Design a protein around this ligand. Structure first.
Ligand SMILES: [Cl-]
Length: 262
C-alpha cells in the first residue's frame, strides 16, 4: 500500500558535504523527495553535473550572496510546479525557501538563520520567525497539504536538547524561540512529524563542531518536517541517525503512508 519517504538534510555547504560522501549516501536511501538546506551554492555552482542524482529531478534556489543560504530539492517525480521564495526579504534574498507541488500536497525545503553570531544575526532570525508565522497563519486556510522540511535552529521542548538548563540562555532554546514553535504546533495546528510517532528523548539533529559535543551527545533537535494537520495520521516512521553525517546536522528521514503523485 501507499508509501513515501522524505529525507531532509542541512548540508552546511553542499560542496563540503558532497566531498564527505552525501550524494552516494543519498542515492542509496530510496527517497521519493530529498530536501537540502544551506547549500551555499549559486545557480551556476549547482549546474556542476556531480550534484545530480540518478533517477531524480533537481531544483534549487540561491542566495544573492550564495554562501549566506541556498536550498535544493530532488524529486523522483517531476513536480507540477516549483516555486521559490515566500514573499518576504529574510527568505527571498537568501534562497531559504523552495517548494514542489504534487497532487494534494506540496513539499518544501526551508532554512532559517541560526542566530548564533551576535545580536544582529538573532534580530534577523526573529524577523524571519515572525514573518513565517504570518505566512503560516494565512496558508493554513488553503486546502492543500504541506510538508515543510525545515532547518529551524530552534528546539521546542526540554527533550529536544541535552542539558536544557544551560541551553535556555543560548540561541536555539530561548524562551521566545520555544514560544514561536508552541504557536506553530499549538494554536496554528501544525504537526511535528517525528513527534507524531515518537515521544522518546535523545533524538537530536545538530551538534556544535567539537569532539566533546560529539562524545557526550550535546545535541539539539533543530530539523523538522512540519506538517499540515491533514497529514498528521499518515506518519509511519521518523529517524534522525547519528551517522553517517556530512555536516553539523543529522539527516531526518520520514516515511509516510501516502502515495505521492502529480
Ligand atoms: Cl519571535
Amino acid at each position: 500500500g501507499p508509501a513515501m519517504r522524505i529525507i531532509s538534510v542541512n548540508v552546511n555547504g553542499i560542496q563540503a558535504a558532497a566531498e564527505r560522501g552525501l550524494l552516494s549516501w543519498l542515492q542509496a536511501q530510496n527517497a521519493d523527495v530529498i530536501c537540502l538546506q544551506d547549500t551555499r551554492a549559486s545557480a551556476f555552482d549547482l549546474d556542476d553535473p556531480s550534484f545530480q542524482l540518478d533517477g531524480y529531478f533537481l531544483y534549487a534556489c540561491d542566495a544573492e550572496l550564495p554562501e549566506q543560504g541556498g536550498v535544493a530539492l530532488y524529486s523522483r517525480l517531476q513536480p507540477k510546479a516549483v516555486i521559490s521564495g515566500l514573499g518576504f526579504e529574510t527568505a527571498d534574498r537568501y534562497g531559504r525557501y523552495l517548494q514542489a507541488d504534487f497532487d494534494k500536497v506540496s513539499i518544501a525545503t526551508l532554512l532559517l538563520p541560526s542566530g548564533q553570531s551576535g545580536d544582529e544575526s538573532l534580530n534577523q532570525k526573529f524577523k524571519f520567525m515572525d514573518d513565517f508565522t504570518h505566512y503560516l497563519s494565512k496558508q493554513r486556510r488553503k486546502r492543500r497539504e504541506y510538508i515543510y522540511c525545515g532547518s529551524l535552529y530552534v528546539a521546542h521542548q526540554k527533550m529536544d536538547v541535552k542539558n536544557w538548563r544551560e541551553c535556555q540562555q543560548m540561541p536555539g532554546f530561548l524562551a521566545p524561540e520555544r514560544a514561536w514553535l508552541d504557536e506553530v504546533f499549538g494554536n496554528l495546528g501544525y504537526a511535528d512529524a517525528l513527534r507524531e510517532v515518537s515521544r522518546e528523548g535523545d533524538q537530536f539533529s545538530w551538534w556544535p563542531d567539537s569532539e566533546q559535543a560529539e562524545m557526550l551527545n550535546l545535541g539539539w533537535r533543530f530539523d523538522y518536517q512540519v506538517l499540515t494537520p491533514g497529514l498528521r495520521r499518515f506518519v509511519r516512521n521518523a529517524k534522525l541517525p547519528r551517522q553517517p553525517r556530512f555536516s553539523q546536522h543529522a539527516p531526518l528521514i520520514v516515511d509516510y503512508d501516502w502515495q505521492l503523485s502529480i
